[PDB]
Write a protein that binds this ligand. Structure first.
Ligand SMILES: N=C(N)NCCCCCN(CC[C@H](N)C(=O)O)C[C@H]1O[C@@H](n2cnc3c(N)ncnc32)[C@H](O)[C@@H]1O
Ligand SMILES: N=C(N)NCCCCCN(CC[C@H](N)C(=O)O)C[C@H]1O[C@@H](n2cnc3c(N)ncnc32)[C@H](O)[C@@H]1O
Lengths: 342, 342
C-alpha cells in the first residue's frame, strides 16, 4: 500500500503499538485545550455534520466521531489501525451509537469504505506539525471525499521565529563536552567530541518558553489540506526572511503551529503558539551549532527543508544567514529523536 | 543465527538503534558505581588479564576493553552489533591501541573469532537483571572460552522481596478512574475502566524507594555464568518463601540484582540494591492485583516465573499466598513495557 511503501516495518510496529495503550489516549484526552477546541470546532459548525457522512482518520478512542455524532452526523466511518479500534467499538456500543459510528479496523491506505464522505475529520498533527507523517494519511483519505467535501482541520500554519536562549545553548554544549575528556578513567574520549556535538544538536528541543526570547516576528508557512496532495509532504521547503527586531545572538529557530477548522458557521482555531495556553504539542526549537550575531534592523534569511524519511519523521535541514554580514549557520536535525526538556 | 531465531526483527532494530546513540553511552558511563566498579574489578584482578586474550561482548564505546588493556591484556576482541562499533574503532585508533583491541562489528552469535579466549567481559545486565536478554549472548559467547577460562561478571544474584506501598497501589486506580466518567465532553467512558486498570497493572514499575517499604528479607536467585547454558534463561523459575518481618498489606514484589567479578586476586561486587547508591538500573516493582495481609512471623510463598519472549524481554508471572491464611494473589506483567516512575 501507500503506507507500507513509505514506512519501515519496525517503525510502523512501534508506532501502532504506542497508540494501542489506553494511558496514551488518556494523556491526549486530558489536554483540555485540544479536546475542547475540537469539540467547539465540530459542535459550533453543526451544519457541516448534520445528516452528513463523515470519515474519521485515525480515530483512536473515537472521541471526534462522538463529537460528529453529537453534531448530528448520519454516518461516521471511524478508521483506526492500532488495537485501540477494539476499545473504540466498546465505547460506540456502550454509548448506544452503533447506528451512527462504524469502526473500520486498518490503515486508511488499505481499507475499503462503502461510500464517499461529505467531511473528513482527524488529528494528524505531530510536533512541528509534520512529525509522525500522519498528514499524508489524512490527505490520502481525500480519495473518499466527495467533490466540495470539507476537511477538519482545513489548514495548518507553521510559524517559525529566531530566538536567543544562551542557557539552552550551553546545556546542550555542556552535555556534548563530556566527550572532550582526554582521560575519562584513563581513556581519551576526545576524538568523538565532534560526533557527540552533532548528535546533541540534531535533537529538536520540545518545551515551552517566554515569548521574550523571540527576536523577530514569525514567518508563516501554510498548508491547505483541501488542496495539498500526499506527495507534497515528502519534501517541504520553507524559505524565510526575518526582519530582526532585537540585537543579540540568535541560537536557533522556534517552531509552533496553528490549525483552522473553516466551517460554514465559523472558523475555529487550535493554536500551539507560545502566546496561547500550553498544549501537549508544546513548541519546538532547533538550535544552531554556532549562534549568529544580528543587530536590530538586520535581515536573517534562509531555508528550512524537511525531507520525509521512512521512520515516520523528517530530516530537517536549516540554513540561515545574516544578510548584512554573510554570517551563516547550517544545521541538520532528526525530528524522530527530540529532547523533551519540559 | 541463534540471535535472529529468538528475536523479532522489529525489536532488534529498535534495540540496536537505541544503543547507537552517544548520549546513551554517556548516561551509562556517568553512572560512577557502574563504571568505577568495572574498572576496579578488572584492574585489581590484573593477573586475570596480563598477557591474556579477552572477548568483550557488546563493547559499546569500548570502555571495558580499554580497562582490559590497562590491565595488560595481549589481545582483546571487542564485539558490537550497533553502529556504536564505528565510534569504538575511532577510540581504539585515537588511544593508540590498534595492536591490542580488535573491534568486530556484528552480533556475537554471528561473527567469527580467530581464536579462543582466556576471559570474557561484558555488561549484559538489564532491568531486573534479565531484561533485554543480553545474558544469553554472554553465555552464547562461551563457545569461544578456553576450558577453565573466566567470566567477568562471574555470577548474578537476583533479589526479590515483598513490599508495602499503599500510594503506589492506589495510583493505578486513580489513573484508571479517568475512564470512570459518564460524560467526558458528552461521552460515557466508563466501559473502558477495567481495561485501563488491567493495562496499568501489567507494567512493572521502574524507580527507587525507601527500604522501609520492604516487609521481609530478600530471596536470592543465583545464576552462575561459568556453568549456565543459554537455554537456562528461556524459563526462569524463582520459588520464594518469605519470612515476614513486618505486619501489613503486601502490594507486590520488588526486584534488584548484584553481580560478582570473582577474580584470582579478589571478588568485586556491583550491587543495585536499594540499600546502595542509586544506579541507572534503579529497582523494579511488580504489583499484585490484590494486596495480601500478612503478620510478622507469617510466610509468603509462591513463584515468580519469567518466560522469555521474542521482544528481547520476559513475560513475568507472579503467584503468591500467605501460608497461614490461604490468601492468594497473582499478576502477569510485561517487562518490555515498564512504567518509568522515577
Ligand atoms: N505529538 C503528540 N504527543 N501527540 C500527537 C497527537 C496525534 C494523535 C492522532 N491520532 C489520534 C487522534 C484521534 N482523534 C483521537 O482522539 O485519539 C492517532 C491515531 O491515528 C492512528 N493512525 C495514524 N495513522 C493511521 C493510518 N494511516 N490509518 C489508520 N489509523 C492511523 C494511530 O493508530 C493513532 O490511534
Ligand atoms: N539499563 C539499560 N537500559 N541497560 C543496561 C546496560 C546494558 C549494557 C550496555 N552495552 C554494554 C556496555 C559496554 N560494556 C560499554 O562499556 O559501553 C550493551 C551493548 O551490547 C550490545 N549488544 C547487545 N547484544 C549484542 C549482541 N548479540 N552482539 C553484539 N553486541 C550486543 C549493545 O548493542 C550494546 O552496545
Amino acid at each position: 500500500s501507500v503506507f507500507s511503501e513509505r514506512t519501515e516495518e519496525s517503525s510502523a510496529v512501534q508506532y501502532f503499538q504506542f497508540y494501542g495503550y489506553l494511558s496514551q489516549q488518556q494523556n491526549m484526552m486530558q489536554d483540555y485545550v485540544r479536546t475542547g477546541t475540537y469539540q467547539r470546532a465540530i459542535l459550533q459548525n453543526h451544519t457541516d455534520f448534520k445528516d452528513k457522512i463523515v470519515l474519521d482518520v485515525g480515530c483512536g478512542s473515537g472521541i471526534l466521531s462522538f463529537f460528529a455524532a453529537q453534531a448530528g452526523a448520519r454516518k461516521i466511518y471511524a478508521v483506526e489501525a492500532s488495537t485501540m479500534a477494539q476499545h473504540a467499538e466498546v465505547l460506540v456500543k456502550s454509548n448506544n451509537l452503533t447506528d451512527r459510528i462504524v469502526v473500520i479496523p486498518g490503515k486508511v491506505e488499505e481499507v475499503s469504505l462503502p461510500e464517499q464522505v461529505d467531511i473528513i475529520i482527524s488529528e494528524p498533527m505531530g510536533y512541528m506539525l509534520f512529525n509522525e507523517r500522519m498528514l499524508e494519511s489524512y490527505l490520502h483519505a481525500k480519495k473518499y471525499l466527495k467533490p466540495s467535501g470539507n476537511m477538519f482541520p482545513t489548514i495548518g500554519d507553521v510559524h517559525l521565529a529566531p530566538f536567543t536562549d544562551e542557557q539552552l545553548y550551553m546545556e546542550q554544549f555542556t552535555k556534548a563536552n563530556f566527550w572532550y575528556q582526554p582521560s575519562f578513567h584513563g581513556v581519551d574520549l576526545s576524538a568523538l567530541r565532534g560526533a557527540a556535538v552533532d548528535e546533541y544538536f540534531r535533537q529538536p528541543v520540545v518545551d515551552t518558553f517566554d515569548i521574550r526570547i523571540l527576536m523577530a516576528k514569525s514567518v508563516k508557512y501554510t498548508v491547505n489540506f483541501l488542496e495539498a496532495k500526499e506527495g507534497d509532504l515528502h519534501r517541504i521547503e520553507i524559505p524565510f526572511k526575518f526582519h530582526m527586531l532585537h540585537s543579540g545572538l540568535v541560537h536557533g529557530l522556534a517552531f509552533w503551529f496553528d490549525v483552522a477548522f473553516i466551517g460554514s458557521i465559523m472558523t475555529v482555531w487550535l493554536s500551539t503558539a507560545p502566546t496561547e495556553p500550553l498544549t501537549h504539542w508544546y513548541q519546538v526549537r532547533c538550535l544552531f551549532q554556532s549562534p549568529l550575531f544580528a543587530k536590530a534592523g538586520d535581515t536573517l534569511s534562509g531555508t528550512c527543508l524537511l525531507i520525509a524519511n521512512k521512520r515516520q519523521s523528517y530530516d530537517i535541514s536549516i540554513v540561515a544567514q545574516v544578510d548584512q554580514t554573510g554570517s551563516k549557520s547550517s544545521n541538520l536535525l532528526d525530528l524522530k529523536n527530540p529532547f523533551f526538556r519540559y
